[PDB]
Swiss-Prot record:
It is found in: Cytoplasm; Endoplasmic reticulum; Nucleus. This is Cellular retinoic acid-binding protein 2. The gene is CRABP2. Forms a beta-barrel structure that accommodates hydrophobic ligands in its interior. GO terms for cellular component: cytoplasm; cytosol; endoplasmic reticulum; extracellular exosome; nucleoplasm; nucleus. Interacts with RXR and RARA. Interacts with importin alpha. One of its GO terms (biological process) is regulation of DNA-templated transcription. Pfam families: Lipocalin. It comes from Homo sapiens (Human). InterPro entries: Calycin, Fatty_acid-bd, ILBP, Lipocln_cytosolic_FA-bd_dom. It comes from the Eukaryota. Belongs to the calycin superfamily. Fatty-acid binding protein (FABP) family. Keywords: Cytoplasm, Endoplasmic reticulum, Isopeptide bond, Nucleus, Retinol-binding, Transport, Ubl conjugation, Vitamin A. Induction: By retinoic acid.
Amino acid sequence: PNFSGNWKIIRSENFEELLKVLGVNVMLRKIAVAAASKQAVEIKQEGDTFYIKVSTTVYTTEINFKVGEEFEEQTVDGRPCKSLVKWESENKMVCEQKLLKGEGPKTSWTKELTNDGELILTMTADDVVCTQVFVRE
Ligand SMILES: *C/C=C(C)/C=C/C=C(C)/C=C/C1=C(C)CCCC1(C)C
């Protein structure tokens, strides 16, 4: 696998529906959908160690993890969580998250490198799956 690269979003499906499950009110959902269309992802992968920078026009976040080791990040709506990433196949990984405080929908994400060279990210809250597709810059 080589997830390493600079990725630009080409498609974003069901993101508003995900935010709605997560309690985000309608105007903020619409503005977040617009922000998501400018999403860029930078990945550096060394073996099972990942550095990931996700950004939009006015915001940027760095995610560092090693597969199989718990780390801390935030859910989509912005709540701190404990995350754990495992491989599901050669080029797909899945992250399960657990809220640090309180309760809420069950969230997770997946990252996949397809044969055709796309990066597919999925983000899930309960029953609702958002799918985002990227290509290399
Ligand atoms: C491997 C790639 C990952 C884990 C990407 C995660 C992406 C996000 C947490 C994106 C979040 C965003 C929002 C919550 C609001 C709209 C802007 C986004 C898409 C950057």
